[PDB]
Scaffold this active site. Structure first.
Site, short mmCIF file in Angstrom:
data_model
loop_
_atom_site.label_atom_id
_atom_site.label_comp_id
_atom_site.label_asym_id
_atom_site.label_seq_id
_atom_site.Cartn_x
_atom_site.Cartn_y
_atom_site.Cartn_z
N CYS A 169 -60.81 -10.85 -70.18
CA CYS A 169 -61.37 -12.19 -70.02
C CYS A 169 -60.51 -13.23 -70.74
CB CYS A 169 -62.80 -12.23 -70.56
SG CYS A 169 -63.81 -13.59 -69.90
N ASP B 86 -60.50 -14.23 -74.30
CA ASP B 86 -61.31 -15.11 -75.13
C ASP B 86 -60.89 -15.01 -76.59
OD1 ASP B 86 -62.55 -15.27 -72.68
OD2 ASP B 86 -64.28 -14.05 -73.28
N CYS C 134 -64.89 -17.88 -71.68
CA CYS C 134 -66.12 -17.84 -70.90
C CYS C 134 -67.33 -18.19 -71.76
CB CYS C 134 -66.30 -16.46 -70.27
SG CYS C 134 -67.06 -15.23 -71.39
N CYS D 39 -68.49 -9.75 -73.99
CA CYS D 39 -68.93 -10.77 -74.94
C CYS D 39 -69.87 -10.17 -75.98
CB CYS D 39 -69.61 -11.92 -74.21
SG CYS D 39 -68.49 -12.95 -73.24
#
Ligand code: ZN
Length: 130
Positions: A33, A35, A59, A102
């Site tokens: 992703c 991050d 995100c 996450c």
């Protein structure tokens, strides 16, 4: 999606003095992703978290999980945080199975914080500076 929008500014996002010892530093991002979750908590003499700051980049699922996580460490002690799991978080935010990266990211950040802070408590000086 890939095209990240600019808005919905977060809340209580202000990294702490990373040049100190009383305050640990935990940065855990996502390779896929892409991050960057920068967590920082200030531990007092008693060993309780008095200040907590989170900074997510990427995100939303990440920005949220954190904002909520960093809010759980507040008032609690470094020992309590260690207990905090990701499973609960994921449920709290009610994120999908695709945005799981996450959830875990949050937990990983918390620990890294307390841990890093402890390392300095056990070892004032070492061969590593970083
Ligand atoms: Zn993400």
């Amino acid at each position: 999606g890939s095209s990240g929008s600019s808005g919905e500014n977060p809340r209580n996002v202000g990294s702490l003095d990373k040049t100190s010892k009383n305050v640990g530093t935990g940065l855990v991002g996502a390779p896929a992703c892409g991050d960057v979750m920068k967590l920082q908590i200030q531990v007092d003499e008693k060993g309780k978290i008095v200040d907590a700051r989170f900074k997510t980049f990427g995100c939303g699922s990440a920005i949220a999980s954190s904002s909520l996580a960093t809010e759980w460490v507040k008032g609690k002690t470094v020992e309590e945080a260690l207990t905090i799991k990701n499973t609960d978080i994921a449920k709290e935010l009610c994120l999908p199975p695709v945005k799981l990266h996450c959830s875990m990211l949050a937990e990983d950040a918390i620990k890294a914080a307390l841990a890093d802070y402890k390392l300095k408590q056990e070892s004032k000086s070492g061969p590593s500076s970083g």
